[model samples]
Target chain A: MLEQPYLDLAKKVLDEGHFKPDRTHTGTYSIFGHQMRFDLSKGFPLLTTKKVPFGLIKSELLWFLHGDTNIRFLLQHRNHIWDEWAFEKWVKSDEYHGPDMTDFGHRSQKDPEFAAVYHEEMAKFDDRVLHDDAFAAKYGDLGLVYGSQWRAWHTSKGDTIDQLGDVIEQIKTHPYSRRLIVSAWNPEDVPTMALPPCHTLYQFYVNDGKLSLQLYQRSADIFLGVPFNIASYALLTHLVAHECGLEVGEFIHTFGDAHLYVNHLDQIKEQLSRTPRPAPTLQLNPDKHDIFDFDMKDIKLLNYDPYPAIKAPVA
Target chain B: MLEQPYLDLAKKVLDEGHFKPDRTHTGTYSIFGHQMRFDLSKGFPLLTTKKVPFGLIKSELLWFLHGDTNIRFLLQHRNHIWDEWAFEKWVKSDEYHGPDMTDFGHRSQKDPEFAAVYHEEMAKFDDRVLHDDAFAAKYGDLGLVYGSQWRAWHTSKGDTIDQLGDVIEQIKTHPYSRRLIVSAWNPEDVPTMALPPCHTLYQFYVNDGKLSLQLYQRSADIFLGVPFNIASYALLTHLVAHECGLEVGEFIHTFGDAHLYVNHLDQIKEQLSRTPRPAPTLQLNPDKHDIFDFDMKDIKLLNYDPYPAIKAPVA
Candidate 1:
């Protein structure tokens, strides 16, 4: 697996020096938050030890860039990430103080057509696909994750329409453009959305002739999402710069709600203690240029190594 | 002077209802620091109370949109907004903070040899002219305030050069695009900039084909900058839609730091208490179409009515 530079480095620093054995960081302490810096001038970022599926990175990137809100497409290729959120948005759409999404699996193509109608992927899936009770039975709710809300947006924000490629170029070609920004934090638009924007808006910079990016994520679901955030934007930089004819320079990521999940503290510490491996180089398929055309198989990573894998506990 | 509809209405609400006879809202604190919204559907927004010379807005707009950092060309048209900073850069090759820009106002035209450098027109005396000494000296930093530093920036971060016009199109063409954002918050590039972006970033939204904008200003110098914030973006929305052939929409402003200066509260209340008059109108140089082509002679505001300007002490 390709290892991320900053996340690995952050883990190494925290485990070795920042954290204690038994006294783990506690509930949302306002005073303490972790911070580490990464210099994109060095390499492509992906956390190696945790066994993040390279395909997952491609899938998530494709999903967000395409602004897809539903999961049938993702389930067809990669289903691990939003498997739970889809279920959550499903049950949350109905039942009260419900159990987490783990209570429900996910809806697959095999399920009956009724649930998928108002569901996110309803527009795309046919009954032959939706009727697979086994598939829809497990990861049901189709989901209200970022992907679902983004792609098939229901809110009046009118962003439910496709505009992903346009935004990618916004940062790539207009890094200095003050209007080259976005938000998942729309108050008027969020309630109706299955989920809101967590990685919020990102800002880009260009000096001399080098390009760079910085993200202002409102919140970070550290274990799962943080790694995705790193890989996502890094890959985006590659795509953005490619279209803009500019070289990638820096990626400065700033966070507002950067927190470690109560469930992932051990994993966070485990990842933190190990000696960090060098960031692997990721090569995007040269033939793929448009945001929609690039997906799972389009990327290749080399030379990423880290400590043993930290199994991701199901959310 | 022309008044904006929302601005006029907001003025009425704040003055007739929101005013707290409390001691804080007074003087400059009243109008300058306060925020007023304007709906494009109402009409083009130009402050009618004080007929801002369209020539000035057009010139400044061209300067910023064209990404001309040096103010030599701006002063040629006799606009003094950036004289201070231009002089500073010109003199920087000589000494740091050599002399306040006031002493070196534009050069005399009839002198032995006209330098053709940005001063002759500015030096011409006219009763209609108001050569702002404090502004000329203070703005000596250049118009980088919101224009070049944030709006039309050249970056190598995620791009080579950024023109916010690109952002406008990004939103217009692809609102759901992941990078549909504009920010003046560039950390890595901040140290190198003459000044930082204060009206940090903003997001654009469209509903029923109506375009809207939301500003995320990190800090605001209420009296000096806020009005420009509303007017500028409203102007931006107008121009962008006209160019892209989209309908002009609402300018929804959201502030991060909406503070009332300890000294200005009473004036704010006083202004809040005054009944606002009717809205006014704006006339642009109809001949101009490209965003950057606007100049001093192209801008005109008509029919703004309000009380005399309230003065606020500088911070």
Candidate 2:
């Protein structure tokens, strides 16, 4: 019942979403605007219809909270979600003399011959990022990722503004202020960015000792990304509320262009047919007051029984 | 029927909204994360429950489109909606020699004596801004408002980005682009602003020869502000679609903290009681394709019969 919204959204899009082509050129069944709310007071919003990798979610969120932009940290945690982006940068660099890896992502998925080579190159890149300090510093860092934008926003005066830190302070002092927001959509950087922020901006609202968060994501891959996004922001809300001494209210995920990739349609329908179970509960270390101090060991997921994972290709 | 969503929002908030204190010390009945969609193909969404001044909306939007942050342009068009913010800046400056206008917005609302002095000072300020070019250049500008942030967003490298212009280009070229967004919430400028942006960011969507726009407003004054915001953004969508040679689609409004001021409860109820009429149709100049070049005479609203205005205090 807790994750019905996710299932309902998939069904809604499948039935009425517009057929359109996207950046990946993998056509989509899309809808323009949609909003889904998860009341975090009930339980964590990890999808119970299909198993979601909470470990990856945990490490990535912690990395964001730490204001880390390097793939090294993620590599150390054994999370490979960011490896492709870093490997893309590495392959395009002058120092990289590896096999031809142009359009490696799509090629790897389509051609098994290229997939083996791409996999080997990615392993080497990940190894260098984890072991070779100079190489990691040069190629592993994503200059303007969410971590950079949230923690150190670039200013016109050659200064950086810590949006997350300021927002936390505001939540602590002026809980009722509606100006508590962190924006990652910088018009200055969008032109040159390889992948601009999908979770464009977020706002915090506090009422009756309960804290709520709303995220405005510009683009959403509904079948694959929405579940992860829901869990990630829901966890962020919990951590913020814990630090602010407030009860958890809701995590509202609002979208600009929410779509289901044509390739993921069958996977989504299979997920929709499965009955959702009770959502997992998130546990944070009692000693951890500062959100930035959180680590993988500091957070845990409990009672996450679910159906087998549904596989889908990443667009 | 076209405007029923708005009426439904008011009734829902009244029945279910949380009681909370806000920046103005005026309490509110609030809800977090609400969305309403207005399909512009049916008719323009100017409220038929009460008369909304399309003139003010037109001038203000034109001012933003022109990238003009100075209140002089608004004043030139006989619009006084932004006079208070500019006047606030003027009265606080050393150049102003007038009665003390500290906390003028609220004080003027409660105190008849202060209201008289505040009104007189505002009129003088308006006159000076209209006549004295130097004065208008110096103090009449509300820097970092929607116009400045939308068109000419300041960058770290001492350059500016024209977001509106860029988005229009994207809509023309990559019609299905999800990244066609113009953000007004600049974290760098929010700290010192007298009032940060409420209609924070907006994104455009193009599908099947129809263009839609969705605005993620971080804060909304439902009774007073929502009516104006809906019409303003709906007009913006129409204008952008016209420029891009597409049919106008839906205007989706998503909100963060949608609230009714405690003082405006009766007014909202009065509005909720009125019977809706046929929505008005908007007529844009057929000859003008560039959105920024259009003047007030180029935009018109037709058959806008509505009940008398419902007066409410600005929070």
Candidate 3:
């Protein structure tokens, strides 16, 4: 029953969601205003229906916690989830002379020959980011990603405010405060961004010696993104609660336009048919008091048995 | 049947909410992460269990739409809901020679002598703010409130972004877009302020020729505040949909901390026992094409019969 909420959401979207055209030109079956609650006291909410890559979630969260905006750190940890964004920046610059990679994201999936060339160029770009400090400094930095928004929010006075750190302090000193929130939806940066934050803002609540977090995600790619989002925020909640010496309560995922891509409906239906096993339990290093100091080895998942991975196209 | 979700929320909070100490020291029975969706197509969601002041809601919202942060506009409309905040600023300044009004908000509620003095000083402050242009300009402005945040959001650069206007443009051009959001929680302004935004962020969704809105309120005063919040957002959804030439959809209210004050338990229970009446219908002038251009004469509510008013503490 730990993962039932997620399955219920998927089923609801499939059954009653409205079909609409999205910016990606990919059709979506969406429903506005849905909420899912995961009680972490039961278990970690890693989906037991399909195998979700926990390593990517772990490294990416650590990168955000460190406030590191460069893709070099993620490359060092072998997380390629954000490589496309950084690669887009590098390829679009005047200095680069490469094969025509315009619309590479969609083209690579459709054309085998272009996919090979794209892979080779991406490999070269990754190598440069990993080895050359100058190249990494110039091209790999994502200017206003989650790392920058959460830790170093740009203020009107030309100074940056560390929203996450201030919230952590509030949780310790004023646990009952209702204002513990971190917002990533900066109106200043959104107009210029190609992809804004889906996890737009989150707030924390403390009660009964337990810490609870609720995320207001503006857009959700339900089949591919929601499972990972559930686990990632669940992990963040656990890490913050561990640091604060409180038990974990619930991770509530609220959405604006939660959708199932037209391409992923079959995959989601496949996932819904499978029964959920006992959710995996998360293990954090007890000696680590600061969430920022957590390394890859400091976090572990135990007894995560699931069905084989389901593959779906990203819109 | 139309307003049952509200009754359910109040009853749930009373039965299962955790007792928590709050900022005003009024004490609260609270629950975190609750949502209630009202389909605006049925009727306007003004509670029939109690009489709500729609005039104040209308004046305040129009002031916000006009991007007027000064309390002068609200005072001009004979709405005194914002008078205490402005009065607090004026009374704390060095120019004030009134009686010591420290802790006046709580003291006025408890002591009869302080209540009279507080009301007298408040009336004096309101008169000056209404009459004296220089004085109203000096201390009547509530900086960075909802109006300023929604319309003219300050940026890192010297210029400000008109977030609401841009969102309206997007709604007309790209109706299915998921990023139609306006946020009021500026991290830059929260630390030094005595009161931050309780209604933190809101997003709009357009599907099937109907417009729906969802508000993520960080903190909700359930018994006293929730009813007004429901009607306010419902009215907002109707206005926006009218502007966009679309039908009305649901107004989904999502919360972070929804609570009833300790003193309002009796009032909430009293309402829960009453039978409901037919919900009121909102009528907006079809000639008004822009949300910001509408005035008090353009909007009306019909068939709003309800029970007697329920009074409670402001905290």
Candidate 4:
């Protein structure tokens, strides 16, 4: 029942939310100002109704914790979630000499010929990222992404401030401080970036030897993106609490624009039809005290019995 | 009643919230991640349980709209709520030879003799800010407040970006945009400022020919600050909708760490015990189409009947 809030939110939006057109041309039935809470003390909140990819979430979070913006680390860990953004950068650049990848995101799914060519080009790009240092250095680094924004925020003086590190220190020294926040919504950086951060900002709270976190996301693809978001932030809270020597309290997610895409309605309804099993428990490496030092093997999800994965088109 | 969400949040925090110490040495019964929605179509959400000073709210918002960080503008409008912040800066500087104003905020409340002296110094500061141009220029400016952050956010490239103007333009050109957001959490500026922005970021949404806004506030003091925040944002939604030639939809408030200080428990309890009143309507000058051109006289609250103001200690 830990994942009941997500189901409730989806049902509410399906029942009564207003229909609206979105940037992707995939329309949505959306609601504004919604909140969900997960008490982490009970168990990890990976959705039992559908199998979630925990490995990808774990690696992505560790990449952020280390403040590594380059896609090489993620590729090495076999996480391809971010490959498209990095591939998009390479294909649009002057050095790329291959079949035109114009509008490859949509074309790959819609046309089979384009899909084969897109996959081939993407494979070449990924291989180069793993093998070629110069090529990876040129195109793999996602400047001002979450890793960059969260850890080393660019200052006006051409220097960087370690915001994530500072907040961690504050949590240790002054956990009672109301200013426990890390913001990814840098105004100066938003215009130039490919994707402005959707998980806009997050704040930490401490009470009775427990650490809690709240994330404010500006826009969400509830069916596709929200499951990953919940698991990612919940993992982040657990890691931070482990470092601060505190127990996990809760993970509160606040949304500005939460929507279920029209194309994903069948998948969502199918998901709602399944009964939730017992929640999973997360186990972090006992030997690793620093969150930054966490590797893929150090984190594990236990007893995660979930329903069959339901496939849906990514729009 | 239109204000039921506000009442519900307050009551829930008082009844079930956990006690935690705060930065001010005042303890709070705090909860993380709360939301409230106000239907602007019903009425303007000025609180009826307590008589909020609408004039001060109007002047402050107009000052921000004008991109003014100077307290002189507020003093001219007889708004002294921001006087203490400006006064604190002057008292701490080497140019001041006045009686030691150290610990003045708490001492002034606890000790009557110091209170009188502090009041006299404050009055002199306000008078000089209004009358003497040279003196006001030196000390009247409260730099890096909402006005500066909203209108001219400083960039790392030695330039300023007008976030509010840009957002309004975005609303006009692309009303369906999910990226219609204005953020105040400048990482480069937070360390040096006396108080960082609690109302961190807000996003605008357009649906059904109506405009709505959602504000993500990182920290909130429910009894003291939430009332002012609600009215200010509600008014902001109305003004923006007016300029864009649309009807006002809703103003949704999302919070990170919302709390009531232990010292104000009785005040909140009394507020919850009272019967709610019919909400008041807002009247804005019809001729002013641009939000930036709004003046104090252009805005008014109609038929606002409310209970007497209750006093509470500032933490």
What's the CA error at residue A152 for candidate 4, in Å?
1.1
| Model 2 agreement with the true structure over B1-315: per-residue lDDT tens digits | 888889998998899998886655768888888899999999999999999999999999999999999999999989998898888778875977768778877789779789878877888889999999999998888887888888898887888889899889999899978798888887877888887888888888888899989988878888998999899999999999999999999999898888988888899988887899999989999988778999999998999999999888777
| lDDT-superior candidate, 1 or 4 | 4
What's model 1's lDDT at B179? 38
- What does the lDDT come to for candidate 1? 0.51
Weakest 10 consecutive residues of candidate 1 chain B by summed lDDT: B26-35
TM-score of 3: 0.98
lDDT of 3 by residue, A66-151 (tens): 99899999999889999999999889966688786889988997788998898899999999999999999999988888989999
Residue B131's lDDT within candidate 1 is 53
Per-residue lDDT value at B140 in model 4: 90
lDDT of every model, 2 decimals: 0.51, 0.88, 0.89, 0.88
For A34-60, candidate 2 gives per-residue lDDT tens digits of 898888989999999988999999999
What are the root-mean-square deviations of the candidates from the true structure over C-alphas?
Answer: 19.2, 1.3, 1.1, 1.3
Per-residue lDDT tens digits of candidate 4, residues B1-315?
998899998888998888885656668888888888899999989999988998999999998999999999998898988888888888986768879778898899779789889888898889988988988887898888898999999888888999999989888889888899999888877878888988888999999989999998878888999998999899999999989888899999988878998888899999888887998889898877877888998898898899998899887
Model 1 chain A: worst 10 consecutive residues (lDDT sum): A23-32
CA-based DockQ, model 4: 0.83
* Native contacts present in each candidate (fraction): 0.00, 0.96, 0.88, 0.90
Writing each residue's lDDT as its tens digit, candidate 1 over A32-66 gives: 12233456657777776565665677777777666
- DockQ, in order, for the candidates? 0.02, 0.87, 0.87, 0.83
Off by over 4 Å in 3: none
